[PDB]
Design a protein around this ligand. Structure first.
Ligand SMILES: [K+]
Ligand SMILES: [K+]
Ligand SMILES: [K+]
Ligand SMILES: [K+]
Ligand SMILES: [K+]
Ligand SMILES: [K+]
Ligand SMILES: [K+]
Ligand SMILES: [K+]
Ligand SMILES: [K+]
Ligand SMILES: [K+]
Ligand SMILES: [K+]
Ligand SMILES: [K+]
Ligand SMILES: [K+]
Ligand SMILES: [K+]
Ligand SMILES: [K+]
Ligand SMILES: [K+]
Ligand SMILES: [K+]
Ligand SMILES: [K+]
Ligand SMILES: [K+]
Ligand SMILES: [K+]
Ligand SMILES: [K+]
Ligand SMILES: [K+]
Ligand SMILES: [K+]
Ligand SMILES: [K+]
Ligand SMILES: [K+]
Ligand SMILES: [K+]
Ligand SMILES: [K+]
Ligand SMILES: [K+]
Ligand SMILES: [K+]
Ligand SMILES: [K+]
Ligand SMILES: [K+]
Ligand SMILES: [K+]
Ligand SMILES: [K+]
Ligand SMILES: [K+]
Ligand SMILES: [Mg+2]
Ligand SMILES: [Mg+2]
Ligand SMILES: [Mg+2]
Ligand SMILES: [Mg+2]
Ligand SMILES: [Mg+2]
Ligand SMILES: [Mg+2]
Ligand SMILES: [Mg+2]
Ligand SMILES: [Mg+2]
Ligand SMILES: [Mg+2]
Ligand SMILES: [Mg+2]
Ligand SMILES: [Mg+2]
Ligand SMILES: [Mg+2]
Ligand SMILES: [Mg+2]
Ligand SMILES: [Mg+2]
Ligand SMILES: [Mg+2]
Ligand SMILES: [Mg+2]
Ligand SMILES: [Mg+2]
Ligand SMILES: [Mg+2]
Ligand SMILES: [Mg+2]
Ligand SMILES: [Mg+2]
Ligand SMILES: [Mg+2]
Ligand SMILES: [Mg+2]
Ligand SMILES: [Mg+2]
Ligand SMILES: [Mg+2]
Ligand SMILES: [Mg+2]
Ligand SMILES: [Mg+2]
Ligand SMILES: [Mg+2]
Ligand SMILES: [Mg+2]
Ligand SMILES: [Mg+2]
Ligand SMILES: [Mg+2]
Ligand SMILES: [Mg+2]
Ligand SMILES: [Mg+2]
Ligand SMILES: [Mg+2]
Ligand SMILES: [Mg+2]
Ligand SMILES: [Mg+2]
Ligand SMILES: [Mg+2]
Ligand SMILES: [Mg+2]
Ligand SMILES: [Mg+2]
Ligand SMILES: [Mg+2]
Ligand SMILES: [Mg+2]
Ligand SMILES: [Mg+2]
Ligand SMILES: [Mg+2]
Ligand SMILES: [Mg+2]
Ligand SMILES: [Mg+2]
Ligand SMILES: [Mg+2]
Ligand SMILES: [Mg+2]
Ligand SMILES: [Mg+2]
Ligand SMILES: [Mg+2]
Ligand SMILES: [Mg+2]
Ligand SMILES: [Mg+2]
Ligand SMILES: [Mg+2]
Ligand SMILES: [Mg+2]
Ligand SMILES: [Mg+2]
Ligand SMILES: [Mg+2]
Ligand SMILES: [Mg+2]
Ligand SMILES: [Mg+2]
Ligand SMILES: [Mg+2]
Ligand SMILES: [Mg+2]
Ligand SMILES: [Mg+2]
Ligand SMILES: [Mg+2]
Ligand SMILES: [Mg+2]
Ligand SMILES: [Mg+2]
Ligand SMILES: [Mg+2]
Ligand SMILES: [Mg+2]
Ligand SMILES: [Mg+2]
Ligand SMILES: [Mg+2]
Ligand SMILES: [Mg+2]
Ligand SMILES: [Mg+2]
Ligand SMILES: [Mg+2]
Ligand SMILES: [Mg+2]
Ligand SMILES: [Mg+2]
Ligand SMILES: [Mg+2]
Ligand SMILES: [Mg+2]
Ligand SMILES: [Mg+2]
Ligand SMILES: [Mg+2]
Ligand SMILES: [Mg+2]
Ligand SMILES: [Mg+2]
Ligand SMILES: [Mg+2]
Ligand SMILES: [Mg+2]
Ligand SMILES: [Mg+2]
Ligand SMILES: [Mg+2]
Ligand SMILES: [Mg+2]
Ligand SMILES: [Mg+2]
Ligand SMILES: [Mg+2]
Ligand SMILES: [Mg+2]
Ligand SMILES: [Mg+2]
Ligand SMILES: [Mg+2]
Ligand SMILES: [Mg+2]
Ligand SMILES: [Mg+2]
Ligand SMILES: [Mg+2]
Ligand SMILES: [Mg+2]
Ligand SMILES: [Mg+2]
Ligand SMILES: [Mg+2]
Ligand SMILES: [Mg+2]
Ligand SMILES: [Mg+2]
Ligand SMILES: [Mg+2]
Lengths: 132, 254
RNA sequence: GCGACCCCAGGUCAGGCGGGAUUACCCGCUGAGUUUAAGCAUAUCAAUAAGCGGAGGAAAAGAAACUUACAAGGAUUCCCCUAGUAACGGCGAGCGAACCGGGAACAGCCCAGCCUUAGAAUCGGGCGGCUCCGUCGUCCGAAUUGUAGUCUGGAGAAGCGUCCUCAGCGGCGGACCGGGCCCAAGUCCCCUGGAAGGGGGCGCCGGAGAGGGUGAGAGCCCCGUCGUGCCCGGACCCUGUCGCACCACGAGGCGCUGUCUACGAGUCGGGUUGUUUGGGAAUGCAGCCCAAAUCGGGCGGUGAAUUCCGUCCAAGGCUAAAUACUGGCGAGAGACCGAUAGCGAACAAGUACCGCGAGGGAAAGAUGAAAAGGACUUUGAAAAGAGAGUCAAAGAGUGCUUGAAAUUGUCGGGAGGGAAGCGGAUGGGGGCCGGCGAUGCGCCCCGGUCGGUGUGGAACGGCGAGCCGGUCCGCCGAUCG
RNA sequence: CCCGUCUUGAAACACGGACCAAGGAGUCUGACAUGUGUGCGAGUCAACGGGCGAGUAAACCCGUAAGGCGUAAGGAAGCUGAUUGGUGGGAUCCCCCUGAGGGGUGCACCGCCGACCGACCUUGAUCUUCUGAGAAGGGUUCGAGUGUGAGCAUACCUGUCG
RNA sequence: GCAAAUCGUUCGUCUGACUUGGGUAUAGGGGCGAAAGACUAAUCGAACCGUCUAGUAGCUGGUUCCCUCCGAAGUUUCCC
RNA sequence: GAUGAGUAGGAGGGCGCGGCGGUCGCUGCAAAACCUUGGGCGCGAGCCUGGGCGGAGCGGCCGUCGGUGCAGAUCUUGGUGGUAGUAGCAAAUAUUCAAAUGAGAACUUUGAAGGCCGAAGAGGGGAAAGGUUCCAUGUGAACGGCACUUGCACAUGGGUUAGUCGAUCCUAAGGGUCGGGGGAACCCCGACAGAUAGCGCGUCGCGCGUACUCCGAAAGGGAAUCGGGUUAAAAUUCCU
RNA sequence: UGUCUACUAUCCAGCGAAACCACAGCCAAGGGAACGGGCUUGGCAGAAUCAGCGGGGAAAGAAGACCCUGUUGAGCUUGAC
RNA sequence: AACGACUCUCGGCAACGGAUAUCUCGGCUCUCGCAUCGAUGAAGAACGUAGCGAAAUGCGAUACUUGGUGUGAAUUGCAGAAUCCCGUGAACCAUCGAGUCUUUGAACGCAAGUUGCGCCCGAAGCCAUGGCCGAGGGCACGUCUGCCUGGGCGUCACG
């Protein structure tokens, strides 16, 4: 049960806040779990998906497929993964959108900001979860 | 606990509609004036009219609340407390107390010191109350009907009620995450939790301190309560409810 | 003629102020009728709607010219009660307060007048400096037709002595309000399925089983949720603590003192008229007429004179809190509505459209998990059809979820000499129904299988220490069921 | 003979109705009343508010000379204010007797008649502060009175009224 | 109906109290009227728009499921 | 054991719809809704079930609650019939031939013929009013009450050139106002209660000086443009 | 009374409404809310369809404007209040 | 009185229509917090503004945005971009303190069915103190304080 007076339990408000969220907010909402190998390495559970990350699909008809992210289509709440495509009636190839919660990040596109973000995520877990 | 609901006072009357009168081969209902729109000439103001005003519109000053006399409320609580000590009534209300060692179920005061939900569940297993708590979790389901979209998404069966007698006890937060399990302080017992659905026989787990306070709070048949000024437990119209003993007694059968 | 003052005029003179908008609540004015009275005119609707103005986060009210008649209360406001009461009313219909009492909150004050006259001690503006919501210097003005001090009836002035009280800023922290960041636990095995988020199995978190998202009922996939920790900012108010400074000249408090002791005018009040009120020989308000007083004045719910008594001090002013809030901005919630409902408006709705104009004012939501939105072949001028393709599904094909009725076509059955339908009773022809309709039972032996009085244990029971029992295991006997 | 409807009278040459879907009309609230359920009972009521509390619009607790209704009425008012039951029927129970019987018991309710309080009238020994007190004794008068309380809260139907 | 006043033929007047455009003045118990209660935007013996207003109606119409039980009155008195 | 009519009206026991507090269940191995010449239960309101469709929710039971049950109201909104391929297409004299174009021609275009408007026109312009209808090209549908290859429709693009034509300036009936006078105020009167506006001449001074430097005419008054030529569409405006 | 011309009607291609509609549509008498398409008793009665017609459908159009009632108005008048 | 047509009727399928069921970034009701429009030009109205837009939303000739800060890699219907990536850094992102903010409107030079009719100041530039040119701004009413210039025998005083 929630106790914060500033937090609403209304279904209507929750859905509106989700589907009208700005692009910066949609980035956090479009997070994916790290692989068991990366979780033990960085001590981090979830990360927002990035364009150059490598992920593996763990749900859906493309379960088991692995590839590199090529487009984070935030407006459509999906990501496009290299080689994860289907053929149209005319034979053309189109990428299939996949929700980031249904994939696992196998390799991270590290950078100056990404590494700093990993430290902050691990800092809280190393203290609020273990030292307590 | 009800919140008032009512339609808007101006609903169905934001119109200058007037009756055409008779002599035009149509009913005398008021109608929207003007033209150039489908709305023109349509009926208005009538409870039988599309877009009109409902009959007897609901008002906020409906009498929502009720004040039952205090002595009757105390009578209801005492009956509910007494019903919780009868295993037949507790079973009849749907509680699974087949492994409960005894009713009333009184446990050591050390349970009030439990801080972790994992330890709280182990306490329920030891005293045999876990099966009733497990029933509540397995009954978790979505509410049928329109209630599910009214912020009343989920329903479930009631679990055990735990009564404690120490203010600020830490078990209030160790047990609260368990579905179906309610926690209440002995000094402020609530009828809605003692007889949910207006049905007697709630499964109650008493702490030792809470159990020992019942005499002081509710008094006895001889002396009055210490915290309910001038209150005495009600008497029944029948001292012995066992008809078989009365009917089959030597005095009657002679 | 030259000067001072007075009144007035001009200025794109220097620097300021005002208008309009908004409607939920608030203040002032103005002001109906429908209606009720079973007609109707007083009344009632209503001191309301409409009309015209003025404000704020609240407004308004407010420190008694009060209540009361008691053993007295003590600014205002608000709630409960007083009370549907006293009273008012074609005493009809109806209408209708207040004090006491219990609570919320709580706060008190500022002027005018006799009182600097050894000093207008006051204020504004120009210019300059500084530690700049201010302060200091200087200059020019305002002002004696009176600025500032002192005083406000609770008092007070003056004198006397008791020897009591009174003089700032800064540093840090807390409290208060706002924001930001990290942080629990499965996506393990089997089955179904287009998809597992479903079922079954095995685990885990829980101060987190609020809520939402994700291809079906997801605590453990994602965002959040619980609880800490860390960081940033706003208010300058309140509060804790520290450092520095800390002149009682004066002023106040207390006590006494012969004396003094100034308090609001065309206002109060009265007559009259109108209106209003529960206010009735007149509740308030307003017009006109009259027009005060200072050991006095107002009030004391029946007009008047006389004698007392109680009570307060109008005609000047300010003031937080308790209270109100269908507007604005932000937030939470619901036994509310679910696209003819709910706001008129779930959508490019006060929109399209109508009216010269004031105004009037709709209809209109749902493919799929994903466009994967139908390549290509063939017929046709084209629309399009046929086949094929995508999809779990086109029996989801861009107003496409589901797809009822009225009504229509077609195929099949049947009937029909100016209605048809309908009740009851059979028949013909259809359609439908195997719980629509059974096949067991008893006694024999052949075989097979499975258990059997008396003593030992195990866990219990009925009746109330003791009697009375069954169940299960084992061992003998018995040798049947 | 076509339904619905007003009507003494409808198949009517009385009115509404071409057909289908969906919408569509005794409700909410204040006052009062009878009845019934429930709690307590000469009391009853947590109602403004306060203390709190499911981290909480609930529940729980609080009436200390509060307040409402009831506990006493009559009178315009000044005022005064219940001396506390008799009898005919009658439920139940007890005794005798075994009859349409006889005794004891006599609730509820009804009939009848006194008494008491008050308005009005009447009455006055004995006292007193001269207008009061009250020994005795009253009444074809009047009252929404008394003669060992029955109310208060709450729920709902029905009815009157706004 | 071509038309919420039109069409055909036939008719009145035609240098005048003549016809007509634009500008301008008069607004609802008001205007304007060589006067018909005419006209005042298809509205006139009191326009149009919004509001008071869900105005009131002793009068008309309607008033939504099933069985079961009981079961009327059109008569009295008073009443613009 | 007796007994059974019922309008207006009363009451009882039941049926059904949507929530809430409880409780017991169902569902992608197919919920709700809907369809059925499947079957059954109840006097009845209704209920249970087979099959089909549909593809994600739903039900029983106890209590409790309500915007809770329709054939009617010249009821409301929406939809749909018979009427009916019916009434109807008829004023303004009128068309015909050949060829071209086109899938398609009584209706488009060219040519020829025969008619009409007959200068108070069915011709050539403009003011109001409209606002792109103007011009070119193209065109699936819709629309142009038959049809169309067509266009005042639809799509794309193009087009309006001024010292001399107007507005602009002036004043008319009148309108809007200062001051003043009224008015609770919105507003009323309108140069009528008043230190006007300023102008002229010298170079800041003299002189003059009667309370509006306002609005009000694309037909009143009024400074100045003429031929010739030019575009798919403009001209007294472009060119000379 | 006859006859002549044009445009309709008429027939065709194309296009294509509305009023109205309880259910419907052959009569005589009877009874009946006293004037029936339906009821009673008779006469009778044979698919589908075209052009006309105005007897009937007490045909349609409109909650009678006449008259009366209502404790409804409104315009106007006066010796009504 | 067959067959067939027609009419009616029953069933299957196909139409017509949008009821029902399940939904919902909306409505309605209750409660809470806050106090913030304008001559420093508001509310409202108009016009304009994007590589491809009409509307809605946004914005003002710096015109679906500039700047700062935060966030840390998109926007997306298409096109294009050695724009951008261990970063002075993507975004139709968030936020706000810098900055821009056309014509109007209480609306203020006068007007208005007019982009009509006036007056004043004036940077920059330029031709020989003057002249042209000109960015930009100013000129309403009422009123307060102060000030300047004046009027009247209004009341005086002195020549
Ligand atoms: K100074
Ligand atoms: K979920
Ligand atoms: K004084
Ligand atoms: K008066
Ligand atoms: K006095
Ligand atoms: K609507
Ligand atoms: K489908
Ligand atoms: K009727
Ligand atoms: K009738
Ligand atoms: K009829
Ligand atoms: K009491
Ligand atoms: K109390
Ligand atoms: K009396
Ligand atoms: K003529
Ligand atoms: K009028
Ligand atoms: K009547
Ligand atoms: K349930
Ligand atoms: K069925
Ligand atoms: K229910
Ligand atoms: K023109
Ligand atoms: K010109
Ligand atoms: K002109
Ligand atoms: K002239
Ligand atoms: K020329
Ligand atoms: K034809
Ligand atoms: K007859
Ligand atoms: K009239
Ligand atoms: K057939
Ligand atoms: K059929
Ligand atoms: K629906
Ligand atoms: K502006
Ligand atoms: K725009
Ligand atoms: K920015
Ligand atoms: K002008
Ligand atoms: Mg009709
Ligand atoms: Mg409505
Ligand atoms: Mg449902
Ligand atoms: Mg100035
Ligand atoms: Mg009346
Ligand atoms: Mg009446
Ligand atoms: Mg009347
Ligand atoms: Mg008003
Ligand atoms: Mg104002
Ligand atoms: Mg304000
Ligand atoms: Mg306040
Ligand atoms: Mg104030
Ligand atoms: Mg005072
Ligand atoms: Mg007071
Ligand atoms: Mg009372
Ligand atoms: Mg009144
Ligand atoms: Mg008080
Ligand atoms: Mg002074
Ligand atoms: Mg002093
Ligand atoms: Mg003194
Ligand atoms: Mg998580
Ligand atoms: Mg599992
Ligand atoms: Mg699904
Ligand atoms: Mg937290
Ligand atoms: Mg005074
Ligand atoms: Mg007076
Ligand atoms: Mg008045
Ligand atoms: Mg004040
Ligand atoms: Mg508010
Ligand atoms: Mg709607
Ligand atoms: Mg619905
Ligand atoms: Mg679906
Ligand atoms: Mg469909
Ligand atoms: Mg059908
Ligand atoms: Mg009759
Ligand atoms: Mg009938
Ligand atoms: Mg007849
Ligand atoms: Mg009638
Ligand atoms: Mg009819
Ligand atoms: Mg319905
Ligand atoms: Mg009762
Ligand atoms: Mg009391
Ligand atoms: Mg007396
Ligand atoms: Mg007496
Ligand atoms: Mg014609
Ligand atoms: Mg007038
Ligand atoms: Mg005339
Ligand atoms: Mg006449
Ligand atoms: Mg009107
Ligand atoms: Mg009378
Ligand atoms: Mg019967
Ligand atoms: Mg249901
Ligand atoms: Mg059928
Ligand atoms: Mg059911
Ligand atoms: Mg409801
Ligand atoms: Mg209803
Ligand atoms: Mg219906
Ligand atoms: Mg009916
Ligand atoms: Mg109808
Ligand atoms: Mg209709
Ligand atoms: Mg039709
Ligand atoms: Mg025809
Ligand atoms: Mg014709
Ligand atoms: Mg012809
Ligand atoms: Mg012709
Ligand atoms: Mg032709
Ligand atoms: Mg001719
Ligand atoms: Mg000719
Ligand atoms: Mg001529
Ligand atoms: Mg056509
Ligand atoms: Mg053209
Ligand atoms: Mg066009
Ligand atoms: Mg000219
Ligand atoms: Mg003039
Ligand atoms: Mg004016
Ligand atoms: Mg003036
Ligand atoms: Mg003059
Ligand atoms: Mg001029
Ligand atoms: Mg002019
Ligand atoms: Mg001219
Ligand atoms: Mg031209
Ligand atoms: Mg006949
Ligand atoms: Mg007939
Ligand atoms: Mg016959
Ligand atoms: Mg025939
Ligand atoms: Mg006829
Ligand atoms: Mg005819
Ligand atoms: Mg008829
Ligand atoms: Mg009539
Ligand atoms: Mg009529
Ligand atoms: Mg009437
Ligand atoms: Mg009468
Ligand atoms: Mg009248
Ligand atoms: Mg935008
Ligand atoms: Mg202006
Ligand atoms: Mg302009």
């Amino acid at each position: 049960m929630k106790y914060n007076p500033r937090v609403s339990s209304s279904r209507r408000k929750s859905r509106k806040a989700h589907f009208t969220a700005p692009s910066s907010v949609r980035r956090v909402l479009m997070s994916a779990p790290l692989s068991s190998e990366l979780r033990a390495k960085y001590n981090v559970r979830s990360m927002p998906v990035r364009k150059d990350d490598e992920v593996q699909v763990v749900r859906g008809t493309y379960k088991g497929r692995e590839g590199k992210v090529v487009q984070v289509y935030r407006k459509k709440w999906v990501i496009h993964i290299e080689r994860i495509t289907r053929e149209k009636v005319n034979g053309s190839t189109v990428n299939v959108g996949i929700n980031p919660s249904k994939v696992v990040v196998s390799k991270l596109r590290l950078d100056k900001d990404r590494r700093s973000l990993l430290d902050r995520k691990a800092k809280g877990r190393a203290a609020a979860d273990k030292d307590k | 606990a009800r919140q008032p609901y009512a339609v808007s006072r101006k609903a169905g009357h934001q119109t200058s509609a007037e009756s055409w009168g008779t002599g035009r081969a149509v009913s005398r209902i008021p109608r929207v004036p003007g033209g150039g729109t489908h709305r023109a000439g349509q009926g208005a103001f009538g409870n039988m009219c599309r877009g009109g005003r409902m009959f007897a519109p609901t008002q906020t000053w409906r009498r929502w609340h009720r004040k039952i006399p205090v002595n009757q409320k105390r009578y209801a609580v005492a009956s509910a407390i007494a019903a919780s000590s009868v295993p037949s009534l507790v079973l009849a209300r749907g509680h699974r107390i087949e492994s409960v060692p005894e009713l009333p179920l009184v446990v050591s005061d050390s349970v009030e010191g439990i801080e972790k939900t994992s330890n709280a569940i182990k306490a329920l297993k030891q005293i045999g109350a876990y099966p009733d708590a497990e029933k509540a979790k397995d009954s978790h389901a979505i509410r049928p009907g329109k209630g599910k979209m009214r912020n009343r998404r989920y329903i479930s069966r009631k679990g055990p009620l735990i009564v404690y007698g120490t203010e600020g006890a830490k078990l209030v937060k160790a047990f609260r995450n368990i579905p179906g399990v309610e926690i209440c302080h002995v000094d402020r017992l609530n009828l809605l939790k003692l007889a949910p659905g207006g049905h007697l026989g709630r499964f109650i787990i008493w702490t030792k301190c809470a159990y020992e306070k019942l005499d002081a709070i509710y008094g006895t048949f001889d002396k009055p309560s210490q915290e309910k000024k001038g209150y005495l437990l009600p008497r029944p119209k029948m001292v012995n409810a066992d008809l078989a003993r009365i009917i089959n007694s030597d005095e009657v059968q002679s």
